[PDB]
Design a protein around this ligand. Structure first.
Ligand SMILES: [Mg+2]
Ligand SMILES: [Mg+2]
Ligand SMILES: [Mg+2]
Ligand SMILES: [Mg+2]
Ligand SMILES: [Mg+2]
Ligand SMILES: [Mg+2]
Ligand SMILES: [Mg+2]
Ligand SMILES: [Mg+2]
Ligand SMILES: [Mg+2]
Ligand SMILES: [Mg+2]
Ligand SMILES: [Mg+2]
Ligand SMILES: [Mg+2]
Ligand SMILES: [Mg+2]
Ligand SMILES: [Mg+2]
Ligand SMILES: [Mg+2]
Ligand SMILES: [Mg+2]
Ligand SMILES: [Mg+2]
Ligand SMILES: [Mg+2]
Ligand SMILES: [Mg+2]
Ligand SMILES: [Mg+2]
Ligand SMILES: [Mg+2]
Ligand SMILES: [Mg+2]
Ligand SMILES: [Mg+2]
Ligand SMILES: [Mg+2]
Ligand SMILES: [Mg+2]
Ligand SMILES: [Mg+2]
Ligand SMILES: [Mg+2]
Ligand SMILES: [Mg+2]
Ligand SMILES: [Mg+2]
Ligand SMILES: [Mg+2]
Ligand SMILES: [Mg+2]
Ligand SMILES: [Mg+2]
Ligand SMILES: [Mg+2]
Ligand SMILES: [Mg+2]
Ligand SMILES: [Mg+2]
Ligand SMILES: [Mg+2]
Ligand SMILES: [Mg+2]
Ligand SMILES: [Mg+2]
Ligand SMILES: [Mg+2]
Ligand SMILES: [Mg+2]
Ligand SMILES: [Mg+2]
Ligand SMILES: [Mg+2]
Ligand SMILES: [Mg+2]
Ligand SMILES: [Mg+2]
Ligand SMILES: [Mg+2]
Ligand SMILES: [Mg+2]
Ligand SMILES: [Mg+2]
Ligand SMILES: [Mg+2]
Ligand SMILES: [Mg+2]
Ligand SMILES: [Mg+2]
Ligand SMILES: [Mg+2]
Ligand SMILES: [Mg+2]
Ligand SMILES: [Mg+2]
Ligand SMILES: [Mg+2]
Ligand SMILES: [Mg+2]
Ligand SMILES: [Mg+2]
Ligand SMILES: [Mg+2]
Ligand SMILES: [Mg+2]
Ligand SMILES: [Mg+2]
Ligand SMILES: [Mg+2]
Ligand SMILES: [Mg+2]
Ligand SMILES: [Mg+2]
Ligand SMILES: [Mg+2]
Ligand SMILES: [Mg+2]
Ligand SMILES: [Mg+2]
Ligand SMILES: [Mg+2]
Ligand SMILES: [Mg+2]
Ligand SMILES: [Mg+2]
Ligand SMILES: [Mg+2]
Ligand SMILES: [Mg+2]
Ligand SMILES: [Mg+2]
Ligand SMILES: [Mg+2]
Ligand SMILES: [Mg+2]
Ligand SMILES: [Mg+2]
Ligand SMILES: [Mg+2]
Ligand SMILES: [Mg+2]
Ligand SMILES: [Mg+2]
Ligand SMILES: [Mg+2]
Ligand SMILES: [Mg+2]
Ligand SMILES: [Mg+2]
Ligand SMILES: [Mg+2]
Ligand SMILES: [Mg+2]
Ligand SMILES: [Mg+2]
Ligand SMILES: [Mg+2]
Ligand SMILES: [Mg+2]
Ligand SMILES: [Mg+2]
Ligand SMILES: [Mg+2]
Ligand SMILES: [Mg+2]
Ligand SMILES: [Mg+2]
Ligand SMILES: [Mg+2]
Ligand SMILES: [Mg+2]
Ligand SMILES: [Mg+2]
Ligand SMILES: [Mg+2]
Ligand SMILES: [Mg+2]
Ligand SMILES: [Mg+2]
Ligand SMILES: [Mg+2]
Ligand SMILES: [Mg+2]
Ligand SMILES: [Mg+2]
Ligand SMILES: [Mg+2]
Ligand SMILES: [Mg+2]
Ligand SMILES: [Mg+2]
Ligand SMILES: [Mg+2]
Ligand SMILES: [Mg+2]
Ligand SMILES: [Mg+2]
Ligand SMILES: [Mg+2]
Ligand SMILES: [Mg+2]
Ligand SMILES: [Mg+2]
Ligand SMILES: [Mg+2]
Ligand SMILES: [Mg+2]
Ligand SMILES: [Mg+2]
Ligand SMILES: [Mg+2]
Ligand SMILES: [Mg+2]
Ligand SMILES: [Mg+2]
Ligand SMILES: [Mg+2]
Ligand SMILES: [Mg+2]
Ligand SMILES: [Mg+2]
Ligand SMILES: [Mg+2]
Ligand SMILES: [Mg+2]
Ligand SMILES: [Mg+2]
Ligand SMILES: [Mg+2]
Ligand SMILES: [Mg+2]
Ligand SMILES: [Mg+2]
Ligand SMILES: [Mg+2]
Ligand SMILES: [Mg+2]
Ligand SMILES: [Mg+2]
Ligand SMILES: [Mg+2]
Ligand SMILES: [Mg+2]
Ligand SMILES: [Mg+2]
Ligand SMILES: [Mg+2]
Ligand SMILES: [Mg+2]
Ligand SMILES: [Mg+2]
Ligand SMILES: [Mg+2]
Ligand SMILES: [Mg+2]
Ligand SMILES: [Mg+2]
Ligand SMILES: [Mg+2]
Ligand SMILES: [Mg+2]
Ligand SMILES: [Mg+2]
Ligand SMILES: [Mg+2]
Ligand SMILES: [Mg+2]
Ligand SMILES: [Mg+2]
Ligand SMILES: [Mg+2]
Ligand SMILES: [Mg+2]
Ligand SMILES: [Mg+2]
Ligand SMILES: [Mg+2]
Ligand SMILES: [Mg+2]
Ligand SMILES: [Mg+2]
Ligand SMILES: [Mg+2]
Ligand SMILES: [Mg+2]
Ligand SMILES: [Mg+2]
Ligand SMILES: [Mg+2]
Ligand SMILES: [Mg+2]
Lengths: 59, 74, 92, 53
RNA sequence: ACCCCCGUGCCCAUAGCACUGUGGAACCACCCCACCCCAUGCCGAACUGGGUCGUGAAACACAGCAGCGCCAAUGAUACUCGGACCGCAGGGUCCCGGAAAAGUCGGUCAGCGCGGGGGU
RNA sequence: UAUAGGGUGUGACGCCUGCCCGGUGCCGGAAGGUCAAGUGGAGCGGUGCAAGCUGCGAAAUGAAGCCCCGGUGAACGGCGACCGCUAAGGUAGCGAAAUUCCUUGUCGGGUAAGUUCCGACCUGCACGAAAGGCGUAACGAUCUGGGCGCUGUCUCAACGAGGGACUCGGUGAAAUUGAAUUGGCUGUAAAGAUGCGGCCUACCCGUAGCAGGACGAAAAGACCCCGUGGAGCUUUACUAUAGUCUGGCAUUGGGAUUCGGGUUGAAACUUGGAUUUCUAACCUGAAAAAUCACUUUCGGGGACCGUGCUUGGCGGGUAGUUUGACUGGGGCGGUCGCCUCCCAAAAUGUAACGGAGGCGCCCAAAGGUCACCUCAAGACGGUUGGAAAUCGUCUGUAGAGCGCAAAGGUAGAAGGUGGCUUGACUGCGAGACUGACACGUCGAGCAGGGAGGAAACUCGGGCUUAGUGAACCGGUGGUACCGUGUGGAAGGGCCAUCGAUCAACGGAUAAAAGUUACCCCGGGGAUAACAGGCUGAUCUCCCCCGAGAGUCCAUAUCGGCGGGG
RNA sequence: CAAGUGAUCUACCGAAGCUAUGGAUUCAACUCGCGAGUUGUCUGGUAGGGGAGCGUUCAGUCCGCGGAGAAGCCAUA
RNA sequence: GGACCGAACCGGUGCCUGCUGAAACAGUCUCGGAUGAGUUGUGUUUAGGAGUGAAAAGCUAACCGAACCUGGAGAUAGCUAGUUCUCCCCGAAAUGUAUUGAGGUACAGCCUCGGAUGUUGACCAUGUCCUGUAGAGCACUCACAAGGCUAAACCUUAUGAAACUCCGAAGGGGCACGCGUUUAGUCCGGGAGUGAGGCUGCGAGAGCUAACUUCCGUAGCCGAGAG
RNA sequence: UUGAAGCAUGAGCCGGCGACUUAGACCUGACGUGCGAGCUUAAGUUGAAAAACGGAGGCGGAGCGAAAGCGAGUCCGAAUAG
RNA sequence: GAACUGAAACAUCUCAGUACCUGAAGGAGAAGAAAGAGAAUUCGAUUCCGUUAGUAGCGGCGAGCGAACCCGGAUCAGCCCA
């Protein structure tokens, strides 16, 4: 696909799929907690079976 | 009317006799229902968690005398 | 309804400029003769596609002399190249 | 989080400059006296400048 | 060691309250005065501070006491896991273990430490 | 060639045609408000050593249009959602009318008897003046009621005739058809049985007949719902558009006047604007040469018009489309996310168009910490102050409070009061709660720095549980990674933030309403209307008790309040 | 005159359940060849997964057949 | 003379017959117009968002709210049908969550095949913790029966409760152990289907303590199960 | 289809026609084979009663990051916690 | 110079410069002799095949669309006028 290209869904050495963290992103943040600077790299491989064939040339 | 909302999942997560790790959640309840004892912390939501790995144990007589505590093993 | 993909954030980049052919250091030292692979060993050596620069990185190690001509190398590898005797040279 | 013409506000922080931000929610309910608070930027620690705008 | 007092725990009303009796230069307490330490959004009543006499009144401490509280059997029952059923239905039954709440019989005005001061 | 032509509505004729322009349209509207391209171009920035080359870029000026003012109803319209205030609220004439709900309105006429018809009345659910009002001789295969006449329409059918029907010779189709060796009752079964059960009846096969059944045949139901199916139509749904109006620029030229001004108080090279005018462009008509072409001789118009480019408006005339779901059928109504209690069957979880209630905030202190403080209520006694006040003493496991909704929770306090404060922090995050995911919740501890305390220590918002929006696209402050020969810069990225009743709240495009009885297709007995089926609230009927009426006596009859079938 | 019914006892009846005898699958074990063989076991079945196979045409190769008769057709225990 | 009666002709009012017709719109009888806006012959012109129309969305070559033919074109079809040779082994789902979602899809759950692992599964027993229903009971909140007292409170006596609780089982849940029987379990990876359920007993709501009702819970069966 | 002998769909009968395919230097699994610290060619050239030739390229071989980049390390960050 | 279709609705977008129409022409045609490609101070008219490569990029950054340079081949000619 071209969708996950500059986007999330990064493959790794083990072939596992890397997800970013969403809430909140560039708007509607406010509030208090760390959590703003706490949206990092993440993952699950349950959905990821379907994310491999979407973009695999690269990781 | 038809407006009731959500499950909320409050419970006693690790029952007495069980071997907790460090950071495990012992109880989920609402305000004070269980009082944090030896080796047990408490958060914003109340909800006792484990300070030190070991065996969890329940202590009560009556009222608000309910207590959750830990002790090590080796 | 609305796929995970679209739900998920990113902007990031593309780029992907210069990328280097890796030469594993264990390949030279110890096994074979530690025969001084020189500048172009190519065949019998591990670089193939090329048309991309080559970089030398530390993996395996032994004390034997070597002379390696590569486009670049890791300083911790280039540490072990001279400390076993020998050198790594780079283009002007 | 939602915003309108109404009372209180979202107000950003000062220049810990550093050119830096904090932005706690605030209110014009008590007073318009503005504000200043203590925070830490890139540079140093606790450089304490004034609530902006 | 014993009597007892002051502190401080464990237990976390069968250890609590009221009626009440002992206690006083050893301990507690009130009492005494305080411009300043300190402090009452008023009052040194409370903290706080300087110290006797007085007092054993209040508060405290122990002994008494079972009127009130609190604990509370055995018997039976309610209900019920499992088994097997009657009624068109509301509902009900039999076997099998489990087995309350209340109530009565009663049981009580505690128990168990650590340290220090004072009599024998 | 306005006694003409187009459009619109009304519809011989006669008596006539009212009130209301607020909104919409249309005609006329020097002030003023907004407004496009385009003239103008102060200034901000990039690169180069510079000459300079370049990226944006506003005051002023700029047309039609809407806003604003006036008028116009044989213009769209309006003249009872209890009078309700909105520009006004019905002039004649008519009214139970093709309009009337209640309704078979009430009288009257006609009939032996009239929901109709006629006449009145009027209380017009929802008459009314060119969607014309009310009349009208004549006309009508028009519609309604009545009478005479005659009659097989009828009481009530009979006889007769011809043509089929039947019989013999000749030719000889059709739809339909799982296969059949194809009965009655009463059950049972997917809820109407020849085919299951029990019982009954029944010798084999035909011809003329009858239409109850075979849910008989015919046409993948046209009603109904469904499909992110279709097509016709509509409009102040969306969006473009033929068309049309308007500014600028060409075609497209000259001269006078005037104002604006530059280059060498006038001269004057002049550059444009405005009115005016001329005539070679250009349009156009008559002349022996009909459409043309011409020396044309001419006559009129004439920088306009027309036409090419571009600016903005108008634009159902046309075109593509949109118009959610839930739902004891669909619609109308209500409802979509979030928190609390009940349902919930002593773990968690659990539905209904089930039973109640709240949220889309607030708090610069209602936060951090550090100290102290203890409430509701009653009784007695007390001062413009008494139900309630303020004071006093006594009682006072909480009967109080906790910003809001309830539950939990709280007296060693989270509740009441002050001191100082900015942790309502940057960098992380052991290990767990919860979710299909994506979210969501708790958190010891490490560092950089702080805050309150003398100190142990506590602090990365609040007694907790509601106070929310994925991604995209973008605004602002940083940061300096990318940056298309190189060096910069435009542009992009990471850090922080701002934008969402995207509330149909996992959010369809940046942007969207109706109608179809002219309807089409694909399906559905997954789903209404008819019938059956189960049920029996309601409907029908019977019973039980007996107060009361029946002068007397409940029970000849009648049966309060209730009860059972 | 119970074939009605309350209680008690006991004979028989009665399924593809269990049992008898025979036989085949499934997995498992024990070694024999470097598939078979007893033991124990298993085997209702729709969507669906897995496994082993039957038949038709064509093609290569091998072996063959056919006028004393091919394929096709028809009958059969 | 858009006068009258009435043939030709033009037209179709009413009834019937016809309905596998004589006929894909007719026949008998009846009726309308019958010098006008009349009837009709020949040649010709106008057509598919187009024409025509004394106006029905009528007609435009026997079916016109957009003719026919050919083509794009095997349009698309979340819908309906249909999908053929054998035996063997296993064997479901009609739940959850979200969806311009509701008869459709995605993920999880449940099936199968293979590899890895290896009793971790299962039942039952002991031990230990967690719970607020059944029942009960007024000590709180609401309700409520008869008095006493000087209308609330208060006393004797007496009750109800999904959204009351002084109390409170039977069962259920987690962990440990195997004190003893059994035989599965988990991870990795290939392929799925199911996402319309139904009935009964028990526990409730809605309903009328009606339904071969409706919606959840829970066991068993049909589903896919013959005897 | 929850449920069909169904009075629910389809079919008069028999013959023949009749429905899970093909494509690609594509992706991902299983089985099999040949080479295996490597494996393999495409277009084309040559020769065809048959095939060889052809290394352009492709796949392993190094990961982490947004990227510059660094490298058995990398990334967030002042470090260490991850 | 279409639309159905796809985007699970629909406007940008996709179908697709496909279908159809018209014009011209030949056995082929088109194209062609660098104001080029490009980043080696390299190549060297055009067309074609393989590859680069589902790579750069384009996009309601949605559906989806998608190069070229290097290299390997087929064939290889440049000639004339203002
Ligand atoms: Mg990577
Ligand atoms: Mg709840
Ligand atoms: Mg206790
Ligand atoms: Mg003491
Ligand atoms: Mg003494
Ligand atoms: Mg004093
Ligand atoms: Mg006393
Ligand atoms: Mg007992
Ligand atoms: Mg009982
Ligand atoms: Mg039972
Ligand atoms: Mg029964
Ligand atoms: Mg009972
Ligand atoms: Mg038992
Ligand atoms: Mg018992
Ligand atoms: Mg017992
Ligand atoms: Mg008891
Ligand atoms: Mg007693
Ligand atoms: Mg005592
Ligand atoms: Mg002592
Ligand atoms: Mg009219
Ligand atoms: Mg006026
Ligand atoms: Mg009348
Ligand atoms: Mg009526
Ligand atoms: Mg009369
Ligand atoms: Mg009559
Ligand atoms: Mg009358
Ligand atoms: Mg009549
Ligand atoms: Mg009538
Ligand atoms: Mg009348
Ligand atoms: Mg008028
Ligand atoms: Mg009118
Ligand atoms: Mg009218
Ligand atoms: Mg009229
Ligand atoms: Mg009239
Ligand atoms: Mg007429
Ligand atoms: Mg009539
Ligand atoms: Mg009549
Ligand atoms: Mg007469
Ligand atoms: Mg006769
Ligand atoms: Mg006759
Ligand atoms: Mg003959
Ligand atoms: Mg005959
Ligand atoms: Mg017969
Ligand atoms: Mg029956
Ligand atoms: Mg039947
Ligand atoms: Mg019957
Ligand atoms: Mg029968
Ligand atoms: Mg039979
Ligand atoms: Mg007949
Ligand atoms: Mg149909
Ligand atoms: Mg019709
Ligand atoms: Mg549509
Ligand atoms: Mg136009
Ligand atoms: Mg325009
Ligand atoms: Mg339209
Ligand atoms: Mg419009
Ligand atoms: Mg709907
Ligand atoms: Mg409804
Ligand atoms: Mg519906
Ligand atoms: Mg409502
Ligand atoms: Mg529960
Ligand atoms: Mg439960
Ligand atoms: Mg459910
Ligand atoms: Mg609900
Ligand atoms: Mg309810
Ligand atoms: Mg406090
Ligand atoms: Mg200090
Ligand atoms: Mg911390
Ligand atoms: Mg920026
Ligand atoms: Mg550059
Ligand atoms: Mg920049
Ligand atoms: Mg939603
Ligand atoms: Mg949505
Ligand atoms: Mg959107
Ligand atoms: Mg919308
Ligand atoms: Mg009509
Ligand atoms: Mg029509
Ligand atoms: Mg249809
Ligand atoms: Mg039905
Ligand atoms: Mg349904
Ligand atoms: Mg439905
Ligand atoms: Mg009907
Ligand atoms: Mg019908
Ligand atoms: Mg019905
Ligand atoms: Mg029934
Ligand atoms: Mg009487
Ligand atoms: Mg009497
Ligand atoms: Mg009687
Ligand atoms: Mg009665
Ligand atoms: Mg009754
Ligand atoms: Mg058997
Ligand atoms: Mg046997
Ligand atoms: Mg089987
Ligand atoms: Mg022969
Ligand atoms: Mg043959
Ligand atoms: Mg005439
Ligand atoms: Mg006449
Ligand atoms: Mg006619
Ligand atoms: Mg005729
Ligand atoms: Mg006549
Ligand atoms: Mg049209
Ligand atoms: Mg014809
Ligand atoms: Mg026709
Ligand atoms: Mg058509
Ligand atoms: Mg088709
Ligand atoms: Mg097509
Ligand atoms: Mg379609
Ligand atoms: Mg298709
Ligand atoms: Mg089986
Ligand atoms: Mg949700
Ligand atoms: Mg799935
Ligand atoms: Mg397995
Ligand atoms: Mg393997
Ligand atoms: Mg074992
Ligand atoms: Mg386990
Ligand atoms: Mg086990
Ligand atoms: Mg209860
Ligand atoms: Mg109860
Ligand atoms: Mg309760
Ligand atoms: Mg008690
Ligand atoms: Mg217990
Ligand atoms: Mg899998
Ligand atoms: Mg398969
Ligand atoms: Mg799949
Ligand atoms: Mg579904
Ligand atoms: Mg369902
Ligand atoms: Mg269900
Ligand atoms: Mg009810
Ligand atoms: Mg039902
Ligand atoms: Mg099924
Ligand atoms: Mg059976
Ligand atoms: Mg079964
Ligand atoms: Mg059976
Ligand atoms: Mg059905
Ligand atoms: Mg059946
Ligand atoms: Mg049938
Ligand atoms: Mg059907
Ligand atoms: Mg049929
Ligand atoms: Mg392909
Ligand atoms: Mg490949
Ligand atoms: Mg290709
Ligand atoms: Mg392999
Ligand atoms: Mg080998
Ligand atoms: Mg379309
Ligand atoms: Mg579409
Ligand atoms: Mg387009
Ligand atoms: Mg052509
Ligand atoms: Mg030619
Ligand atoms: Mg190519
Ligand atoms: Mg080449
Ligand atoms: Mg050449």
């Amino acid at each position: 696909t071209h969708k996950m290209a500059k986007r999330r869904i990064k493959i790794t050495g083990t072939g596992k799929v890397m997800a970013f963290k969403s809430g909140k992103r560039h708007q509607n943040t406010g509030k208090s907690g760390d959590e703003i600077r706490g949206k990092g790299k993440g993952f699950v491989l349950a959905k990821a079976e379907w994310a491999r064939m979407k973009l695999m040339l690269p990781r | 009317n038809g407006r009731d909302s959500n499950p909320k999942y409050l419970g006693v997560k690790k029952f007495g006799g069980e071997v907790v790790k460090a950071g495990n959640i012992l109880v989920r309840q609402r305000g004070t229902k269980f009082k944090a004892g030896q080796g047990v912390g408490m958060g914003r939501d109340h909800t006792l968690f484990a300070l030190s790995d070991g065996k969890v144990v329940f202590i009560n007589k009556g009222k608000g005398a309910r207590f959750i505590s830990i002790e090590a093993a080796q | 309804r609305s796929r995970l993909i679209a739900r998920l954030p990113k902007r990031g980049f593309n780029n992907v400029g210069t990328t280097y052919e890796v030469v594993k250091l264990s390949q030279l030292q110890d096994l074979e003769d530690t025969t001084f692979d020189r500048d172009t060993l190519e065949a019998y050596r591990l670089v193939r596609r090329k048309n991309r620069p080559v970089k030398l990185l530390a993996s395996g190690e032994i004390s034997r002399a070597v002379t390696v001509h590569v486009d670049a190398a890791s300083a911790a590898a280039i540490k072990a190249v001279e400390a076993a005797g020998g050198r790594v040279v780079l283009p002007e | 989080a939602k915003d309108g013409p109404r009372i209180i506000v979202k107000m950003e922080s000062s220049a810990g400059t550093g050119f830096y931000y904090t932005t706690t929610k605030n209110r014009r309910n008590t007073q318009a006296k503005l504000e200043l608070k203590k925070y830490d930027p890139v540079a140093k620690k606790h450089v304490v400048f004034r609530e902006k705008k």
